[PDB]
Design a protein around this nucleic acid. Sequence first.
RNA 1: AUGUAUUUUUAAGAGAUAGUCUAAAAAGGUACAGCUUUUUAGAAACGGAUACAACCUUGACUAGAGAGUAAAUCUUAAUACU
Lengths: 71, 94, 40, 148, 108, 155, 177, 153, 38
Amino acid sequence: EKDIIKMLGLEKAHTPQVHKNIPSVNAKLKVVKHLIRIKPLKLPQGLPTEEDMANTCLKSNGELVVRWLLN
Amino acid sequence: RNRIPGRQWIGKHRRPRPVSAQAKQNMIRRLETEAENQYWLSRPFLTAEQERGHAAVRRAAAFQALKAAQAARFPAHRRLEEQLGHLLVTRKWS
Amino acid sequence: AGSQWRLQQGFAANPSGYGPLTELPDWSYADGRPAPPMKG
Amino acid sequence: TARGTASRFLTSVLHNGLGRYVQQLQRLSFSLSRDAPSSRGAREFVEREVTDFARRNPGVVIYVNPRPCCVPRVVAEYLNGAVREESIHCKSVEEIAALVQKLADQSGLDVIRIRKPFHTDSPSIQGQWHPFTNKPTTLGGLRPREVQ
Amino acid sequence: TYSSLPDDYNCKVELALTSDGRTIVCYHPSVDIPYEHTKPIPXXXXXXXXXXXXXXXXXXXXXXXXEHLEQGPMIEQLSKMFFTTKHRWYPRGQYHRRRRKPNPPKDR
Amino acid sequence: VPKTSLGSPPWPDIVLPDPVEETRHHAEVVGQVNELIAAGRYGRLFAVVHFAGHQWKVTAEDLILIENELDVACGERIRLEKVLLVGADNFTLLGKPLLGKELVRVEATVIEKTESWPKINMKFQKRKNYQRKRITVNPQTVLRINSIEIAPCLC
Amino acid sequence: SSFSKAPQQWATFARVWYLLDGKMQPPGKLAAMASVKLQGLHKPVYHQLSDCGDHVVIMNTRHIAFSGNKWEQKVYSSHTGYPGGFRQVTAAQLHQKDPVAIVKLAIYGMLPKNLHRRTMMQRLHLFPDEDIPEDILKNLVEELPQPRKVPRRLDEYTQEEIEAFPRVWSPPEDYRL
Amino acid sequence: CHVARNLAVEQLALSAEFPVPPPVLRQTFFAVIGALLQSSGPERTALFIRDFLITQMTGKELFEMWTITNPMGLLVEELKKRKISAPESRLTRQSGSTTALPVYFVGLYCDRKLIAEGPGETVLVAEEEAARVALRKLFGFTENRRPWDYSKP
Amino acid sequence: GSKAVTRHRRVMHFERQKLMAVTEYIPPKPTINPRCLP
RNA sequence: AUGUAUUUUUAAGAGAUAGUCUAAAAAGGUACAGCUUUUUAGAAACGGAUACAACCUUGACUAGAGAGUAAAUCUUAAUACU
Ligand SMILES: [Mg+2]
Ligand SMILES: [Mg+2]
Ligand SMILES: [Mg+2]
Ligand SMILES: [Mg+2]
Ligand SMILES: [Mg+2]
Ligand SMILES: [Mg+2]
Ligand SMILES: [Mg+2]
Ligand SMILES: [Mg+2]
Ligand SMILES: [Mg+2]
Ligand SMILES: [Mg+2]
């Protein structure tokens, strides 16, 4: 279990991390599912372009925001 | 005057301690989170053969970086400026 | 406490995380010169 | 250790910084040897930096003596009447520099446990709590069981 | 005409919210104490220490009070006065007196 | 439903005025206050200020000790920005969870850059033979709050 | 707000004399608040090493109410220290002998266990009925709310409320009561 | 003396007896003041003086430096000058009379309006302090007062 | 250690007890009792 | 496959090889042990189970007169036969 979690980069608690929703990974997640909290990412403004890289924030509802704090 | 035989929590006779309403709550709470988890783990994006080799490109390259990392270990360059700069020790006014 | 309600509104669990609280550069020079940025 | 030492509340020297800020550092006396290695860093500092530092800070006097000394020393003195001693013994130029700048920005006040972070005169604007403050008065100001 | 708490005491209290909405405001004037709720100042002074015959003898009669009790009884009365136990009222030892901070710090 | 000790919920019932009446009452109260501010009838302000990871209760002329190093020349005048609360004898202004910069301003001065007194951190084990002693010194910075200034504008 | 220093401080730490009526109240629910007020935990200035604790006078002590059968099964024990000198007493008996005891033990057992308990035990005044020295009457500041709402007997209700409550069932006339 | 001591004026001064007995220090300090007055405008020395002296009043009271021993009388006089009539002392809050540590709050009333109020160990000292207060609000020396200006016009 | 089967009923490890307390039978609870219905 | 950074070798080394409980599968014993014997899992906090080696929560540094949380405070009921 420990090493699943190690190779998930889930080392440090209460920290979000991102992963492919493919099955290869779901093997692992299925092994540890009681140790974790999974929630779907959501992209309301859509995906970050390069200009939006320094402005991108992640809200606890599981949502990504591209433009953070205009002027 | 009511005693516990031996060690508190250990043997064939134990201090009785009861479950708490609190405890019931905590457990349910975890169960909730995990029901949600095994939901989100149900319906994958890709199928199985769909994800075949889908980054075989990246995964060998990371490993070539890993290889290249230890490639590079050799003793360090040694320079004049050190051996001689040790003489600044005696730097004087006169 | 109060993590729950905070969550349902969509804020951070902790008032320290990602809120305007932490984000803004809390001092300036009186002249108006924008302060040197923060390590956090 | 807390119970070991003295303490001081947090304070200003002569209410400094209120009307106009006044650098509290008065004089510095460097003592080094032109000859000894122990003073090496402090020699270089004397060459290059001292000059400019002096221009940085008009308010402070700097007395620099080469003397036959084996332990390089700098003595800060403060308007507070306080004096602080230091060794520049066997340090870099960078090192010395940073240290003199430490001395530059100090109160002259003594380094002791500082009981609480905030010195406030009359914190109590709009009132200071007393027992009655939230209690409703009655008619005639009578006791609980008093009759009239 | 609505406040959550009675305006009986302290302040009358006005909560309000900016039409913008990003600011709460409060108007709280002090509520002073009604002349109805007051009772007159106690005034008690009476001097019978004056003997009709001689008034220097009588004005030396208010300086005529003083007394002496034992440690135990005095301590009892002392502790019945300020509502403390008999313990506070005993001396402290040499070592313990020695270490009381000679010049204690002052705020304000 | 007669009156039984249960059938009646044991707590005083609730009435909150209609939102229009309250909108009027509010605009009113705010205005009155804004007139107290336009007047400058507030004697002395305090403000609860978020700074450097902490919250402090600040009034003019005073002093706080910050636990970390700030890079400013000694003596510089500095506008603290994040302000949670503001207050004065008669009335009080509350940020959600902050005040508009234009609404208030607080200018403080850095007084003394300094190093903290030695603190002693000692870890120890029973008969495992492990002592570790460390002495730590922390860079500290003392600011004097100079002025709390409040501007007229509020709506 | 603006006071001189000596008076200001005297005001802040000023002791208070509180009164609390015990008629028909659980000794427990009484001692709860009694203890609060004694430790000084109602005062926001509170601190442990600060002497603050407020006097408390409870009156009508004999008139304690005990929920359940507790009158019967709660026993108070104590020991002389002499062999066979051990004493178990029904609450009912104890209170019979000394009205004050019951409440005093509640409050005592309810404070922290350090020394100051002994001292705050001093500021606690306990009266079987309402008989109070006009000394202690004189200094009373304020009355505390009765911690339980006492149920009225049948005979308290106004005929208005007796009639106001609806007749639930209609009895048969023939039946005798 | 204290001030000039912390400005290193005692340090710089030429006089017999190094501890610089306080009078000589006063003289010397004010001498540096007048010399500033000659070397720079009165407007400049104004700034200086308000910086290194006025400040020392910070935190301090009115009746701290006034020392006036009958608050009551002065109160009535200043009231007379205000065309306000008769300060009326009336007891408001009291905790314990049998206490060794009783507390009184005496309110002061003019025409049934409450002008000021005060705490005390006896009714006497209470009246005294409520009077102190009244006087303070009258004259404008009050904690709530606007803290002093420092600005450069 | 006690064998997996005993005479004396065998104290459970705590977390298993927790599991029990959660999994207790809950009977369907009626809106209105059928008897006090008409 | 995939998610990760390990693993194998080569040159040098020592200690250790006298273990405890906890869940699990089994034997012995009395379907007895704080019992013994193996196999797989865990742990040995300054937090909670009052107190506590092993149970549960958590893995770590330095300073704050900041905040969010985790396990956990302790509950559960027993009447006639005309
Ligand atoms: Mg980690
Ligand atoms: Mg035992
Ligand atoms: Mg056992
Ligand atoms: Mg076993
Ligand atoms: Mg052995
Ligand atoms: Mg061996
Ligand atoms: Mg064993
Ligand atoms: Mg093992
Ligand atoms: Mg513990
Ligand atoms: Mg950490």
